[PDB]
Amino acid sequence: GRTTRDDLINGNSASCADVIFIYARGSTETGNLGTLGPSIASNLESAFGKDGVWIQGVGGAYRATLGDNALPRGTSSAAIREMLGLFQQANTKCPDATLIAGGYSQGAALAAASIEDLDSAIRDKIAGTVLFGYTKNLQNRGRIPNYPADRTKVFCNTGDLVCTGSLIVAAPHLAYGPDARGPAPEFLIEKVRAVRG
């Protein structure tokens, strides 16, 4: 439900959760989780328990500006610094936690760029990443640079024009709710369990 979550920033250091989820919303979306993030979060909480997972939206300098989709990596340098900084804070504050990540639309571009640029030692702790309406899907050949295919799950609907090289929004781009409630959190949980047991 809640469209702003700062569980990593707020969370008591000596009480770190075993799993930390960092999620970037789409352009012009509310809070730091937007439309899809809270659905993924509630499903992660069902699986791990409320105290078993920390939900952290990408807020701060990530303004989710529509025009920033036109920048080279589909988001701004300031946004990338913000999301990089949250991965870094997760790994610093909670070194034993398994990380998971996601993003929608610009937030998918942001997740991909941040993961590309992240220290490999920290990137290895990201067990899985889900991307919805990935604006750099065609350009990046369905991948996140420097990150394995088996840890990536891309949800790109037929007729979602952002997945085939443009920035036009059509109805399929607004139809990721079912994925966010089901297959996306399921994938993330499977990836976490494959590493933690």
Side-chain angles (χ1 to χ4, degrees), residues 43-176:
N43 282 285
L44 295 175
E45 293 162 357
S46 289
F48 292 126
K50 178 72 199 82
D51 287 314
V53 62
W54 279 356
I55 309 296
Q56 179 66 55
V58 181
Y62 179 39
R63 293 182 182 172
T65 302
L66 187 69
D68 287 351
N69 291 294
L71 297 179
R73 311 163 84 183
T75 190
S76 73
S77 278
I80 294 163
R81 285 198 297 279
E82 181 76 33
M83 191 170 195
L84 278 170
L86 290 169
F87 285 122
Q88 294 161 357
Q89 289 178 82
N91 189 240
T92 299
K93 188 164 192 179
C94 305
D96 298 329
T98 300
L99 308 182
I100 38 169
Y104 170 46
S105 192
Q106 179 173 172
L110 177 56
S114 299
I115 292 171
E116 174 177 7
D117 291 358
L118 187 62
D119 173 6
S120 61
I122 308 174
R123 199 191 303 114
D124 190 52
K125 302 296 172 41
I126 310 169
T129 300
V130 292
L131 306 176
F132 308 88
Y134 180 26
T135 54
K136 296 298 187 186
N137 183 66
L138 178 62
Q139 299 91 331
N140 287 350
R141 301 154 225 89
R143 297 292 296 279
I144 295 170
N146 297 325
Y147 191 68
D150 67 2
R151 299 190 190 196
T152 308
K153 192 165 181 67
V154 181
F155 298 95
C156 268
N157 285 334
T158 300
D160 184 349
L161 311 178
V162 314
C163 297
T164 55
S166 84
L167 291 170
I168 306 303
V169 179
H173 190 65
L174 311 174
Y176 293 108

